[PDB]
């Protein structure tokens, strides 16, 4: 589409006449708050914001690597959520060495939009604008604050304008305003700027009333008075937050509609206070929320500036995209179009092998004690089925899979239960698909109006005895199935032709060239299996004492099982991988007449 | 298999393989230069291994004249995709001169040079020397051999021949006696040269052929064979039939009991009949892509092209020859350079195969209205003769016969061409047939091939206007591009990016999408597409004539247009697009 500077996107929708919206957020003070905020990021991205924001305050150690910092929240938005992101930054109580350090760190992590702020008790925001330009040149897009009714500390309202003028002239690209109550206020302010010679975009900020706290909040945020009109309607319902928010919505809709109708406003900046409901309904009533949102690819896109060309990945990190980005982040270029057109996969320190969950919860799910390998088989079975284990606990994750199953796995639940129950322990799979509509709600992706294709895939740990039987069976399948077996020692075998990669998901779209975003690559597989095997020990086996029978079992599996991936090349035909497994079970059991 | 001639030599014959060979002489006349390129294209059908062009300083072989040895062989590689050996001789020529010739050989893409003494500071020997110093290895230089031998005595000459192995192989003279050079085989193993031997073969095709055998071979045909040609009448056709039969038998035990290098003499018939008779002539192979791979080394990675030059492959090579790198994978991510212009429509290797007298009979020695022109398009597609008994072999745009896939939509094409939709390119839609399909297959076996339906055609300004209306209700399904000779165009191609219209899915591999429809490339193509009206058809007629006027009027006013149906799993809707356009051009009102 368009992978261009924010201010390039903005003047495009300008000329185009398309109105847009943005969302402002604040870094939470606890991890659980941080975790939930990122979930909201993902839910509200579906609306199509031009951009989102993360505020900045020095009481919150905002430049640090703490998970709750403005810097790490912004960085998550860009690198994991794929969003165009604006990092706010204030220069009250800061020296040159501090600010320059923060700017370098944001550049490394992929940020590329700064809002230059003074902050409240380097003396004025303009010093930060002029400084970003001299020290980083034009690398960053920069925006700056404006005040429709004048800044409080300013003497003349007229003088505040002249100041604004100078910081915009120092090197800013657009203005975001403080909240207001009457469209007419924005309008005069705009004509004051227009008459001053300020020529950049001025985005109005909108603050939705979302309950009773909103009144005290917006006066703290802005130092404006709340009008008796709003006050008189709200004080009768002072204790009914639900009813208040429908009035906030009516007010916001009416205001924005009077702004949008202006034509002198290109977009809308919402102060969300990290809450979803009210802001989404205001935008939907306006017609600015995306009607039929599509996932762009089967995996989520990064917004890092270096990584704009990537549109194909190996399938092996599908449940661990954070590990993939980490192991590839030193690369100079990324594959575009075909994988096989090659920098090495980087190695890893342990914090990526650790689980999120505490030890006591994992033990309740995976088992305080194991009595044999079959104890392990049932944990995978229960991960797939959803039923409770014999102590009453659902299995919500595996060392390889910390989220729930995608929708596509419902196409093959019973087949998967069958093989896990016989000791083929799966960690990745996908059904075959023969050109379903690209808008399909279970497997669709990419532009509307085209056709999506998948070859059936299966990946799994199994004992040496089973693998050895699998290889004999694979001879009848030599031309149809591609196969790769490897153990923790690195003994491996594969019929990948000249060790080339195999496309397994792809899409044909009207008016465009082909997109093949997922492949099975034998070279990548040999780096992936180093993690896959290590996760047995780092998340499961260490839950037990070194001399325990439960550890002996997990360690045994790690030292002996094979990792296996299988692809059925004949996507127009029924998935043949289930019959491959049944043929293996027969071969293993060929001397027992009770299974024939 | 895309490797050098040394690797391309030892790898086949060890693993139960034997190969062809064909030697040609550079022609003397322009008309002969075009005849020879055509004969290059035909006999390339015979799945040969390597081809060969002779050399002699009297014919200024290093020059740029179309008759020069080095141009013929440069054309063989660049425009015909044959792997070729350029002969080179050292007879009396300065140290600098041979160097300049060697510079041009590899530079023009030539890889297999053959060093030979020239019959009037070096003699036979100093061939590999000159080259080797600036040659490299496994580039495959080859040296001459005369089995029954001729000037010296075999003590030094026969010593000098297997001594010059240092040179991947050698070529042997005509063997008049069956297995006469067979004594050369084991004796050549005794010579100690670790390279293989390549044997000759020379046919009889006329009376004045016989004498030609004495002049080039400097040997005497056996008395027995002369006892059968003297009775062979002045009917060179007679003498010929006995020639191929003399041949097929000789090497028959020879191919096994012992590659066959056959001295064509720039003639096809005999050397071919012996080929399929010897069991070494492939007449229907699988195609690796919908279009033919260039033999040049710099186009190693080329695997996607615009659909617009499908009938004019050699023009595409000509207009792309200045490019440093070639598009791989997708077209649009290769940031292509500009196409070079085609200003010379009379290049011997791009001209039409038909002389002007033939084109007049098939296209009309006079034209009376625009409909005169429609009918010629219709006859080309149908195969039926015109009113004067002549089938239409070709069009300005299409100098060969239809591909097999067009039979899937012959009747549909006849309907639109009759109505003034003058087509020059098409393909059917294909929803996943086996890659080994005989009509539309290509690529590795055991996969699936796909096509979006395509249509490209000239039509009048009035028809184009009405087509635009009809397309308003196909906007989501049909991609379109229209343009006239002046350059006014309209397309709904999104962001002007290209559209993939043929692709395949193969076991254990990544996707291959060799054909696109690209709105940028289409602006360069249209210049060539329109110029063919005047250069091929219009200039058949006197400049002031009513015929030329009609062609001139079409060139100056019609639009060229291409259409794609994106919904490959559904029946082709391009035929309904046209019916609706022709409906809208009629005055019902109820
Ligand atoms: C959209 C928006 C986002 C915000 N985000 C944050 C955030 O993330 N974190 C945070 O802590 N605060 C934030 N703020 C608060 C903002 O910092 C305060 O309003 C602050 O008091 C003023 O900062 P400023 O960048 O507007 O400063 P300035 O532009 O420097 O204005 C401050 C005052 O100085 C005066 N002045 C300007 N230039 C000169 C000059 N050359 N000489 C003399 N006087 C001058 C102006 O008239 C004005 O009265 C935000 C405000 C807005 C509107
Ligand atoms: C397949 C083939 C293709 C040909 N193509 C051409 C062509 O394109 N143009 C053309 O003009 N002719 C061509 N000829 C003919 C060739 O040029 C003549 O045979 C020429 O007179 C020398 O051939 P040669 O390459 O064997 O020479 P050389 O290899 O130089 O001569 C070897 C012969 O001469 C003797 N000899 C010569 N010098 C020495 C020496 N210093 N020490 C020892 N022995 C020596 C050897 O004993 C041996 O008999 C071709 C011949 C063949 C078989
Ligand atoms: N333990 C397990 N066994 C089998 N499949 C699993 C699994 N855990 C997760 N999966 C499945 O593995 C898939 C990873 S996404 C697979 C590739 C994707 N269809 C694409 O186009 O790239 C999801 O479908 C997920 O539900
Ligand atoms: N005058 C004409 N009108 C319509 N089609 C024509 C034509 N002359 C030639 N053709 C057809 O146009 C096609 C050019 S080859 C088409 C490309 C092919 N689909 C691919 O995958 O690359 C041939 O099929 C040929 O037979």
Author numbering:
A (entry chain A): 40 to 160, 172 to 391, 397 to 651
B (entry chain B): 41 to 160, 172 to 202, 205 to 219, 222 to 313, 317 to 648
Task: Provide text from the study.
MTHFR catalyzes the physiologically irreversible reduction of 5,10-methylene-tetrahydrofolate (CH2-THF) to 5-methyl-tetrahydrofolate (CH3-THF), a reaction requiring FAD as a cofactor and NADPH as an electron donor. Since the product CH3-THF is exclusively used by methionine synthase, and only the demethylated form (THF) may be recycled back to the folate cycle, MTHFR commits THF-bound one-carbon units to the methionine cycle. Eukaryotic MTHFR orthologs additionally possess a C-terminal regulatory domain that is connected to the catalytic domain by a linker sequence. The MTHFR catalytic domain adopts a TIM-barrel structure evolutionarily conserved across all kingdoms.
We determined the 2.5 Å resolution structure of HsMTHFR38–644 in complex with FAD and SAH by multiple-wavelength anomalous dispersion using the selenomethionine (SeMet) derivatized protein. The identity of both ligands is guided by well-defined electron density, and in line with native mass spectrometry analysis for this construct. The HsMTHFR38–644 protomer folds into two globular domains to form an overall elongated molecule. As predicted from bacterial structures, the N-terminal catalytic domain (aa 40–337) consists of an 8α/8β TIM barrel, adorned with three extra α-helices (α8, α9 and α11). The C-terminal regulatory domain (aa 363–644) makes up a novel fold of two five-stranded β-sheets arranged side-by-side in the core, flanked by a number of α-helices. The two domains do not contact each other directly, but instead are connected by an extended linker region encompassing aa 338–362, with its amino acid sequence rich in Arg (n = 4), Pro, Glu and Leu. Unexpectedly, in our structure dimerization is mediated almost entirely by the regulatory domain, although the first ordered residue in chain A (Glu40) is located around 5–6 Å from the regulatory domain of chain B (e.g. Glu553, Arg567). In fact, this is reflected in our structure whereby the catalytic domain of one dimer subunit (chain A) is ordered, while that of the other dimer subunit (chain B) is highly disordered, to the extent that only main chain atoms of the amino acid 40–58, 129–134 and 155–342 in chain B could be modelled. In our structure, SAH is bound in an extended conformation within the part of the regulatory domain that faces the catalytic domain. For example, Thr481 (conserved in 96% of 150 orthologues; Consurf29) and Ser484 (98%) hydrogen-bond to the SAH adenine moiety, while Glu463 (99%) and Thr464 (62%) fixate the ribose hydroxyl groups.
